[PDB]
A = this chain, B = another copy of it.
């Protein structure tokens, strides 16, 4: 992940990472690819992102981001940049929940590739 990610997040997500990878057939290799800017629209990775976001209430049942909860989780250092990115990329839109998260990731990647990551 990017160097700014708080160490605690790696432990906080561990339980849901395992569950979500199992549920969606996700490989660590796919995850490693999102982080190197190589995102593809395949449910095994896009629904995995949805799954992990939902675990932390970062999105609701229609894959709309909760900006407050997202800003809460992000370090103080990223507040300004993240708020700008959210302004540009939200609300989410797409045919289903996984597509909404794919579309969101692509939007964030355009301006701010280091703000999005997959764990």
Task: Give chain A's interface residues, CB within 8 Å of chain B.
Answer: 2-4, 23-25, 37, 43, 47, 61-63, 77-78, 80-81, 84, 94-99, 111-114
> Within the assembled complex, what's the spacing in Å between the Cα atoms of A95 and B5?
9
Which of A63, A98, A114 has the most CB atoms of chain B within a 10 A radius of its CB?
A114
Our pick among B43, B95, B112 for the contact of A4 (Cβ within 8 Å) is B95
Are B61 and A114 in contact, with the CB atoms below 8 A?
A: yes
Chain B residues, Cβ within 8 Å of A114: 61-63, 96-97
Chain B residues, Cβ within 8 Å of A25: 84
Chain B residues, Cβ within 8 Å of A4: 95-96, 99
18 A-B contacts (beta carbon < 8 Å): A2-B96, A3-B94, A4-B96, A4-B99, A23-B84, A23-B111, A37-B61, A43-B81, A47-B81, A61-B114, A62-B113, A77-B95, A77-B96, A77-B98, A78-B96, A97-B112, A97-B113, A97-B114
> Within the assembled complex, what's the spacing in Å between the Cα atoms of A94 and B114?
12
